[PDB]
Amino acid sequence: RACGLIIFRRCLIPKVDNNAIEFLLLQASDGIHHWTPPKGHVEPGEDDLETALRATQEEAGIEAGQLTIIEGFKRELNYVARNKPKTVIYWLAEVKDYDVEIRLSHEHQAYRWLGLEEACQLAQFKEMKAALQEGHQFLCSIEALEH
User: Fold this and answer.
1) Residue 111, Cα to own-chain centre: how many angstroms?
2) Which one of 2, 36, 107, 111 has the fewest CB atoms closer than 10 angstroms to its CB?
3) CB-based contacts of 61-66 (< 8 A; 24+ apart in sequence)
4) How far is CA 128 from the centre of its chain?
């Protein structure tokens, strides 16, 4: 069981920014080099949201002071990969600074910041695509309520 954060940043130059929201995906070092948001396995007695925060620091180098958890969104993914069951729980979090330094561990070899459509295409896997679409939809609905 793993927990992570769908990490996004806002792109606020309307004359040129194609996507007002970009999502962070990390490419795995091993296997077929999947692309996912930051995530990591739970620890005995650790709260699932604290696992997501810790795994984000470990996999992406993003520290808690650099993030803001967006309340109201959570998405649990259950799927089979390589004949093995996987559960991942994601919350949603915004980086404070567009230019936040991404530092990978040995587990990942690259990262991209992408608009929703391209994030979906790179993520490829249907439940991850759904989770990102749903995250984006949630962010738009909040912005409308605040607007």
Assistant:
1) 11
2) 107
3) 61/101, 61/102, 61/103, 61/104, 62/7, 62/38, 62/95, 62/100, 62/102, 65/96, 66/95, 66/96, 66/97, 66/100
4) 10
Paired with 113 in beta bridges are 24
Contact between residue 2 and residue 89 where contact means Cβ atoms under 8 Å apart: yes
Cα 90 to Cα 11, 39, 83: the distances in Å are 22, 8, 22
Tokens of 66: 């650099």
Distance CA 102, CA 120 (A): 20
In the block, which residue shows the tokens 């936040």? 100
Per the listing, tokens 């980086």 go with 95
Q: How far apart are CA 49 and CA 5, in angstroms?
A: 9
Going along the chain from its start, the domains and CATH numbers come out as 1-147 (3.90.79.10)
Structure tokens at 16: 């040129």
Which are the contacts of 122, defined by CB distance < 8 A and separation ≥ 6? 25, 35, 112, 114
Specify the resolution in Å: 2.1
Solved using = X-ray
Bridge partners of residue 118, in order along the sequence: none
